[PDB]
Ligand binder design. Structure first.
Ligand SMILES: Nc1nc2c(ncn2[C@@H]2O[C@H](COP(=O)(O)OP(=O)(O)O)[C@@H](O)[C@H]2O)c(=O)[nH]1
Length: 330
């Protein structure tokens, strides 16, 4: 699937940057365009893979290149005031050549938290391709203000995209490590999962149709190196992905639609594993629709299974954020 990726804020920027590197290393053809938007000048300079002409500094009149800290209200205001700066950069993207936009951002801060939903709304207003969000939730160790920002940002972001894919840092914390060291490993985990998803063969239509019901999505993932053997290995990965740690933890029962993706060398893929996998996923989810296919990749030394679950509900983490936002209103 061909994406226009826009990273918003420091986290969104680093994730999109890594996505570009991943896509390039594997010749995956995923990141057709990459743009980074920030109010902190130093953050944009630190990027490695996003073209300098696609790094947009906004809010100069308000924060003079110094960021908005964790003031997401100000983040939303600068995104609204300076949306034409962002559009300036987007105008260089060959939009006719993309299947969808993806707006990537941490929700706990200020620039991305406030600006990502503003951008998503702007994009849906002028383009007709789907606009998805990838929202990254904060660690519970960061502090109450970051949780509150995320709660408020989530409420708005989910309403402005066609679907909000979620990755929760709190479920993926790396304990013994430095903050930045933790983010480097987390960003690898993020890109390996969504990179496999966006990479009979699964086409973009199947992804778009899986996401079309809107709301929140979560991704399961398992991988391993290296006819019954093939089938059983596949069904095992499917189980490991469904029961393993999700990008956003939740009960998978009640998901609206599911998509199974198997990626690997053709000789270690077959139809039977995928068909059994789809039935098993339906048993575990009760999903309305369960699609499944593969990404044949010659020369690959790993097989990876990804399950995309769209329209998940009764998610404790989401119910927490809603409660957090509601209390702060009152
Ligand atoms: N996965 C990931 N999350 C990050 C990273 N950096 C920051 N975060 C998370 O993103 C939130 C916003 O931080 P940041 O993007 O720097 O703030 P912003 O630039 O004001 O939007 C933080 O509260 C963290 O939860 C990163 O490199 N990777």
């Amino acid at each position: 699937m061909k994406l226009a990726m826009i990273g918003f804020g420091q986290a969104g920027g680093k994730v999109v940057d890594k996505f570009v590197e991943y896509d390039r290393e594997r010749n995956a053809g995923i990141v057709r365009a990459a743009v980074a938007v920030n109010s902190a000048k130093a953050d944009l300079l630190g990027l490695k893979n996003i073209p300098k002409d696609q790094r947009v500094l906004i809010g100069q009149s308000r924060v003079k290149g110094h960021g908005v800290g964790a003031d997401n209200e100000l983040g939303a205001e600068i995104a609204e005031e300076d949306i034409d700066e962002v559009q300036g950069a987007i105008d260089s993207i060959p939009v006719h050549e993309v299947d969808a936009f993806l707006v990537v951002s941490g929700l706990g801060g200020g620039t991305g938290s406030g600006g990502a939903p503003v951008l998503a709304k702007h994009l849906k207003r002028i383009y007709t391709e789907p606009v998805y969000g990838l929202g990254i939730l904060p660690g519970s160790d960061e502090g109450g203000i970051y949780t509150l920002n995320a709660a408020r940002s989530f409420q708005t972001f989910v309403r402005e995209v066609d679907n909000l894919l979620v990755f929760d840092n709190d479920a993926w914390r790396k304990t013994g490590e430095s903050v930045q060291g933790g983010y480097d490993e987390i960003n690898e985990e993020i890109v390996n999962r969504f990179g496999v998803l966006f990479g009979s063969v699964v086409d973009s239509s199947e992804i778009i149709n899986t996401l079309a019901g809107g709301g929140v999505s979560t991704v399961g993932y398992a991988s391993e190196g290296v006819t019954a053997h093939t089938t059983n290995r596949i069904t095992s990965l499917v189980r490991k992905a469904a029961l393993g740690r999700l990008t956003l933890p939740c009960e998978i029962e009640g998901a609206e639609r599911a998509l199974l993706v198997l990626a690997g060398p053709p000789e270690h893929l077959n139809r039977k594993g995928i068909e059994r996998g789809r039935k098993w996923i339906e048993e575990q989810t009760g999903s309305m629709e369960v699609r499944g296919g593969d990404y044949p990749i010659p020369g690959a030394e790993k097989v990876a299974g990804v399950i995309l679950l769209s329209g998940v509900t009764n998610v404790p983490r989401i119910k927490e954020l809603q409660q957090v936002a509601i209390e702060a209103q009152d």
